[PDB]
Design a protein around this ligand. Sequence first.
Ligand SMILES: Nc1nc2c(c(=O)[nH]1)N[C@H]1C(S)=C(S)[C@@H](COP(=O)(O)OP(=O)(O)OC[C@H]3O[C@@H](n4cnc5c(=O)[nH]c(N)nc54)[C@H](O)[C@@H]3O)O[C@H]1N2
Ligand SMILES: Nc1nc2c(c(=O)[nH]1)N[C@H]1C(S)=C(S)[C@@H](COP(=O)(O)OP(=O)(O)OC[C@H]3O[C@@H](n4cnc5c(=O)[nH]c(N)nc54)[C@H](O)[C@@H]3O)O[C@H]1N2
Ligand SMILES: CCCCCCCCCCCCCC(=O)O
Ligand SMILES: CCCCCCCCCCCCCC(=O)O
Ligand code: SF4
Ligand code: SF4
Ligand code: SF4
Ligand code: SF4
Ligand code: FES
Ligand SMILES: [Mo+4]
Ligand code: NA
Ligand SMILES: [S]
Lengths: 61, 61, 975
Amino acid sequence: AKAIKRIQKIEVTEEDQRKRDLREIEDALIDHKEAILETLHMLGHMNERGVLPLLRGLFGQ
Amino acid sequence: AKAIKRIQKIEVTEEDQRKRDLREIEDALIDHKEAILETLHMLGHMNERGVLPLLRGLFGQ
Amino acid sequence: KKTITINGVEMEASEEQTVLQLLNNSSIEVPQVCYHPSLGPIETCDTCIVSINGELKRSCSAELKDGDVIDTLSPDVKKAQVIGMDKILYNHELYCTVCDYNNGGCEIHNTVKEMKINHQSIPFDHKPYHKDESHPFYRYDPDQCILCGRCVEACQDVQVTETLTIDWERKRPRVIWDNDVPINESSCVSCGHCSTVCPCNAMMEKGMEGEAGYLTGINNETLRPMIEITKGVETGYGSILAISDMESAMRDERIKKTKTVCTYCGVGCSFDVWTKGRDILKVEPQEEAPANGISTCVKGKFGWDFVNSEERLTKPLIREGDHFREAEWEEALLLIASKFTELKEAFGPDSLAFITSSKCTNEESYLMQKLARGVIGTNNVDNCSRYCQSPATAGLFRTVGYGGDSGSITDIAQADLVLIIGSNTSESHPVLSTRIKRAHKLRGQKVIVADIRKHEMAERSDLFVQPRAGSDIVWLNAIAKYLIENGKADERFLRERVNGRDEYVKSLAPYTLEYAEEKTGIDQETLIQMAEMIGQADSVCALWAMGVTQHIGGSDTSTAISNLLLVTGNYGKPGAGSYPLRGHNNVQGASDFGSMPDRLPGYEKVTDEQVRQKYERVWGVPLPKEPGMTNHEMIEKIHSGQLKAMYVKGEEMGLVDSNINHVHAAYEKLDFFVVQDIFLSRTAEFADVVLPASPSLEKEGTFTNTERRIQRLYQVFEPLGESKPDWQIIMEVANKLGAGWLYEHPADIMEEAAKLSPIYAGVTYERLEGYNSLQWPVNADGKDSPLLFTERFPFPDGKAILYPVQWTEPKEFGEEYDIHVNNGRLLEHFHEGNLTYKSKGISEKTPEVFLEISPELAAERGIQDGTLVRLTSPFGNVKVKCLITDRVKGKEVYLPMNDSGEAAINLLTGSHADKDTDTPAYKETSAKMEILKHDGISPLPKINHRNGNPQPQIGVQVHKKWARKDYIFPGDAVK
Ligand SMILES: Nc1nc2c(c(=O)[nH]1)N[C@H]1C(S)=C(S)[C@@H](COP(=O)(O)OP(=O)(O)OC[C@H]3O[C@@H](n4cnc5c(=O)[nH]c(N)nc54)[C@H](O)[C@@H]3O)O[C@H]1N2
Ligand SMILES: Nc1nc2c(c(=O)[nH]1)N[C@H]1C(S)=C(S)[C@@H](COP(=O)(O)OP(=O)(O)OC[C@H]3O[C@@H](n4cnc5c(=O)[nH]c(N)nc54)[C@H](O)[C@@H]3O)O[C@H]1N2
Ligand SMILES: CCCCCCCCCCCCCC(=O)O
Ligand SMILES: CCCCCCCCCCCCCC(=O)O
Ligand code: SF4
Ligand code: SF4
Ligand code: SF4
Ligand code: SF4
Ligand code: FES
Ligand SMILES: [Mo+4]
Ligand code: NA
Ligand SMILES: [S]
């Protein structure tokens, strides 16, 4: 066909890009699932032990 | 019936596995709900006390 | 034969020419800051001080004699090594934790570490010079320079550019570019050699600056006091060297180092790409690289900017009237399947042509032809070898039977004589030419250059003859006639290994010295010298390129070169052979995998019913029996309503086919046009569908270079956006047509193809892992063929064939066209510059095309640098600025290909092609020149390498350093 240069780009809406970015963060959590799960267990123990409430009170007051 | 060995596995799609993995992370948050809630309260106080803004500025500048 | 005793223990010496070479093989600790195996000994660092028979001597230069008592452990030898290191440390500041060269491979760093050094006797004193950061690609930091001369050895004796020298005669020596000019304004060709061989950060790539380290991003304003604080605090070198080692280890998280094969020319340079995310930090050459070693040119070392160009196509484009619509991959593939099936049903399978890219991999060439023959059902396949070495392979097929070079680049560097015909070897095959230049400069290799333009090879040649364009076969036939008749031909070789001798001598009848002098213009006396040099040389490598083949008699002139080599007995032995230099990075491999209308992979003829039947059983479908169209012929068949579709991958046909006005006219007529490329090329503008392809760095696969050397490339980056690697695209197009191909990696494509192609039978990805390579023919046992025709020639009787060839007069354009427009490439630019214009650094020193006018023609037409002229031929016209230089003579001008519009050389060229291979005769272009503007800025800036002033010399001139008053040999520090 004849020579053309103009390209009409595909519309990536604000909401579409937001989903792509959030999905990228979701995939990173999925990849580091074990590390997150372990962090949550560790965090749960810090709360059971005196640690998290003590820090909440140290900054609270 | 006659002897067969071939097993036709059930299709776990990429999106199905993503939901399973995210749901596993959700369940861990639900289990450590109190610890997370306590961390958030402590974090809120760090911000009120101007500790988080100080750190934001220390790294920002 | 030699027996020595090192450190008390005695052991026999093998072929180790030096004491250091033996110590290294024996795994004995010895510092060697200035020793790099690719360069050889320099004797500048003075850290290899070992005691050869009680005498303290530099082991890198010390020759290993029989019965030598070498000691590398006594307190005096160690006290001498530390003294040599103290001078290195006085000229180099250690700041490793915040240095980009602290990547575990720094020779100063690891030597200070190996020597268990904790203090520095001579404090670091800054040199009285500023950093030379003028060049776009690399920079010089004189304060970090240890004056080892590794960069000087590389520039002078390895690269043979001769820009770098060390001003030893100065109060505080430093590396100088030309006669101490800024790097950017010097003759520095930007090859990268000096940065590669530098043992520290003294010469580094600007890509590495602030990127490699975790703390190197800290602005020099804050980082400088940090270094001064650390220097003062420092307890010992070993303490802060451990801190720097931990940080160096951490860099492995960020920096990714991946082996790849250069996407540019046929030299086949392989190297590691250092990438932090998507940023290319540096192209790090490796000694293990089979074709190049540590050698690179500006294109492979620094011309990779295009991979990250904002112009990279990331989405398929479907034409929607007067514009391109960005569309999903599914709709683009569905449309290609619907239209390809439509033209195949209504007009036949032969109404669809397919163009393979010699930029793409062997597997991608194989899949394009499997799509054309096995899926569409046509033999209309081809690649840019049509405009390139089709005449050279036709010549080799007629005489020696294999469509490739006779040997390796190592054989070229070994040759007694190198005959170069119509080949700008240092600009088109830079790393291959470094082997010839070094051999001529140091080993005394004879170099004969036959060319119409005085290029680097012509300037450095032992004999530079200038024959008239197209007359090359006339002098080639005359050299053979004189050598045969004067009894100087290798009659022993011709006897048992050659056929058609008497018919050959009958065809040489018209080519007498008088006829050659008359037609070529080379006098009879110099013709005698050429014949004597060729005949008396024990081993002769004949390297030819587009100066020979881009002609009407290009196939015949190529055959004449092979015939001459047969006569002089230069085949089947190391250091000799026919070397038609392969153009693209993978032109050899694209042809090797059947991207030719007449042949299937492994060069097995299409019309061969036995070959076709083999592929029918494996592919599960019948193959078309009749051959197809050539790349050039394809536009004629569109113009005659025979070709309704074209699938062109990675080929800029809209600018590289001859007579681009006729090619563009054909494009408007064409029913369906699919262009697959990494950018919206000139050709892609005429496409109905453009598919975003991924370049070499974004895919895996293999390339076959000029030496028939199959090399594997590893993926550096993941494919950008929705661009897919070419094999994945070709496979997805075929699958849309019901092919059902199930490849998962190019290695799957290679396994299928190795079984079918006999010359690739033993090729497996396992045999090509890392820097490993295989030269074809590779039998199923994995045994490759580095040197062809050692045992026999691949013909039924094992004998080569002398092929009768006639001179075909080059096409005459007419009396009105008095300018012979010679055309070619430039060292820095690759063709129209679709890849190299994206490189900002290359564009900075060569921003545009230019027309080389001789000082004679410039005087006659009143031309100055920048004069806009209009070359007009019977096919089109170009408007181009002028550049005066004695590189071009009389009425022959030179127009390089680096332009995509007004000055596109293929607007002048005609559709006339070689009579046997249809290779467009690009070196047979005439035109008339009309002045348009008189005053204009010169098209070649002051910073271009061609505006330099090299300082040729043998070595580093280390004797000048020893002649100084301040020089005291570390070994001499006894009393
Ligand atoms: N830097 C760079 N290197 C490249 C390329 C690139 O674009 N840039 N392209 C690659 C490709 S695809 C190609 S094919 C190869 C080949 O590359 P070469 O063939 O080495 O390159 P060109 O300069 O096109 O060759 C033309 C040379 O032959 C001379 N010449 C012209 N006509 C005649 C004639 O009739 N007789 C004689 N004796 N000499 C003649 C010209 O003056 C010039 O020296 O280079 C590859 N290497
Ligand atoms: N006047 C004149 N004309 C000539 C010549 C001459 O000497 N004089 N030389 C002739 C010869 S020898 C040759 S080989 C041709 C060179 O002509 P081509 O073979 O067309 O060469 P390049 O201009 O390098 O075009 C390469 C194209 O491939 C694209 N590309 C790069 N990497 C990839 C990849 O991985 N995948 C895909 N799909 N595309 C990619 C680039 O963006 C570019 O558009 O020129 C020919 N034309
Ligand atoms: C110190 C460890 C900090 C870990 C930060 C975790 C960030 C969690 C992001 C959660 C994103 C939710 C995804 C979504 O809402 O779509
Ligand atoms: C230092 C403590 C770090 C705690 C990390 C918390 C991670 C939060 C994960 C949030 C996941 C959201 C679930 C979802 O989007 O489906
Ligand atoms: S060049 Fe090597 S020795 Fe010098 S500061 Fe950098 S890492 Fe250390
Ligand atoms: S040409 Fe330039 S980059 Fe190459 S070795 Fe010489 S000075 Fe260094
Ligand atoms: S610039 Fe040259 S002399 Fe200086 S350290 Fe680097 S390679 Fe050695
Ligand atoms: S000589 Fe060829 S393969 Fe080697 S770096 Fe230069 S362009 Fe790449
Ligand atoms: S390696 Fe011997 S003096 Fe440098
Ligand atoms: Mo080519
Ligand atoms: Na280096
Ligand atoms: S080529």
